[model samples]
Target: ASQPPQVTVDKLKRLENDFGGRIGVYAIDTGSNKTFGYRANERFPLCSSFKGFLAAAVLSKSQQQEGLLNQRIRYDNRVMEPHSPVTEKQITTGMTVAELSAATLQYSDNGAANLLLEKLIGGPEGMTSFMRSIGDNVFRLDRWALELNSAIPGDDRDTSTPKAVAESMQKLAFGNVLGLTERHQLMDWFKGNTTGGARIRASVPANWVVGDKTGTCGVYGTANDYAVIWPVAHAPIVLAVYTSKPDRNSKHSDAVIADASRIVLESFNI
Candidate 1:
């Protein structure tokens, strides 16, 4: 355990004002059980990042077969979804569970995400019961990540407190949430993420590694990042940063996460 001290983010929230002040952050060192953040418990907008939650659900269940990774499944128009939907002609194509999980986690692939949620966990609303069953009450994600064109943006889709998310991440890191196989599969997928390279990772120490997920919506004007950073020594820390400015884009939102990540790392004397 890192034995990190209690932290306050009154100053950071003030700093948040620079980004429209609609954002919040939550972080915790699961090993030490030490927590820190600004508005760590306040609710905020959550977007496609819920895919990570969906992935967790799959991982938590059905550990019966090691070959589970190779199970073949079908997808098409639904996975292609509203965004120019890559044509139902591709529906006949079948992908393995591992590949679908990769699409869902690494690429934030909609069709893949929805497929896993729908076929694997039952539906897009699966996250609600699964999360609540695990002791979460704050995140009630009613809508699915079904469409990208709905007038109801992610801001109005599902909501969660920054701390609530980080807490979930912490649980995932510890054995309390996932088994070894599940953890390895998840951490590898997140580490392999091609996007979000410039956010939290941009400002962290070169030796430290971050495995995270990103959610963005120009429609809602929000950008968010949730991650677990590993230090060379001691235990890792979970960092969840959210930013909202109706006009937000990849540039500003990523920068906010980078800035906040830097501050959070510094606080732990890392």
Candidate 2:
């Protein structure tokens, strides 16, 4: 993790100033263990991005609990939140634990996220504890979604830094934090994610493999994305870009996120 090049650091700062607030970035080449950072240690609201790791947590639990992933959990409307796209359609029949995890990760389904958090992983504290077990002390999920997306200025609730997010993602996806089976399942879910096309995916080459999760808090221009990307024969790259603006109602920019991502990947000569 040598110091990031001056040109790269300067470009990120320029991007942040253009966006009228802050931009946080952290990227690591798994092959070289090389790293880059810009506001990487600062806290940024996780928003719906936690669902990706939430599914990972579920997979980790499945490895320990026999038949957990296949176990069906009935859906209750009380738990439904605004963006429960996948769960709302299957309200009558409910969904299995595996399907719910997929829904949460791929669709960012709020209800599915809550179901797994409340019924399976023991809620916010449980999520936080699971992160701690994985040696990621910087991640914290303090509340359920909708409320978690408050994105209040200066509040650290439901937040994580870019560096921690990248490290944790690398561990779960390519490292040994989860069992082999669970790791593949987690990667599959991330690979099939339907919510992040305009973000990181927009910046990567079409032939290169990519998996990502996106978060949009709908306030303060706060939004973020993290991904595990493979460029042909090289080892995979893990990176995170998080952004926030001072104005409460500022719109989140997919273009800015994509451009920032391009900057990070270009730094790696990808």
Candidate 3:
């Protein structure tokens, strides 16, 4: 790969001051397979980004003919949490695996996450097994973690490095992990995600299409943004940004994310 153009360090610093936190970023141009940024190997809390893995697990199972996306499952409040919209609805209803996956990615619904998790591995242990099967060894669930069922006190669940996240995204994008059709389904699900702020989305032009996921842990002031940037005929680029230990109120973190992403993309223009 050719040398990457210099980035605006001053602009990145300014953005960091506003977003103000620990951040991680990773980007790879599929065409050139070039990369940029630091701490790409460091592990971070996955938050809802873990749902991407779960989505893959579901599709993997579906591919094996173990579960069908159209298979119906009901949403139970027992799996709900304070911040989840599904829980707030307070209604018991049924939906297919496809619908549950849609809710998990599009809305980051906790209830939907747990339901899919349970369906995948029969329980937390199963979910753990599934993740390991997919080569995500760094992901873990501590005692009383609260992803699927809240009454159990919730275990602490965290994910792997930005590199691993980027790799996962690449695998999904290139149809290396799932079949071509399934890959399309996963990408379609990701396209519907509307949470995780505008850090990544704000960086790209409106006409461009981004299939990605965002993660944030309010307690640790950590923010992460990872996605595949598809700009016209150019091969896609896998971008991951992670930030930790910064000011919660500052926009600096988002700025870092947006700036880092912009710089990586701009490098291609030269």
Please tell me which model should have the higher lDDT, number 2 or number 3. Answer: 2
Q: Residue 163 deviation, candidate 1, in Å?
A: 0.8
Model 3 misses residue 51 by how many Å? 1.0
lDDT-sorted candidate list, best first: 2, 1, 3
All candidates in order of TM-score, best leading: 2, 1, 3
Q: Kindly provide the TM-score of model 1 when superposed on the true structure, using C-alpha atoms.
A: 0.85
lDDT of 2 by residue, 116-193 (tens): 988999999999999999999999999987789999988999999999999999999988889888989899889999
**Each model's number of backbone clashes?**
1, 0, 23
lDDT of 3 at 159: 54
Model 3 stretches astray by more than 4 angstroms? 1-19, 76-79, 87-90, 122-125, 141-157, 246-252
Go through the candidates in order and give the C-alpha RMSD of each one to the true structure: 3.7, 1.6, 4.3
Candidate 3 residue lDDT tens string, 200-266:
8888888788877776555456567788778877888888877665333433255666777786667
Reference-based lDDT, each prediction = 0.71, 0.91, 0.67
Q: After superposition, which runs of candidate 2 have C-alpha atoms over 4 Å from their true positions? A: 1-4, 76-79
Query: Whole-model lDDT, candidate 3?
Result: 0.67
Better of 2 and 3 by TM-score: 2
Model 2 poorest 10 in a row by lDDT: 1-10
Per-candidate TM vs. native?
A: 0.85, 0.97, 0.82
Candidate 1 local distance difference test against the native: 0.71
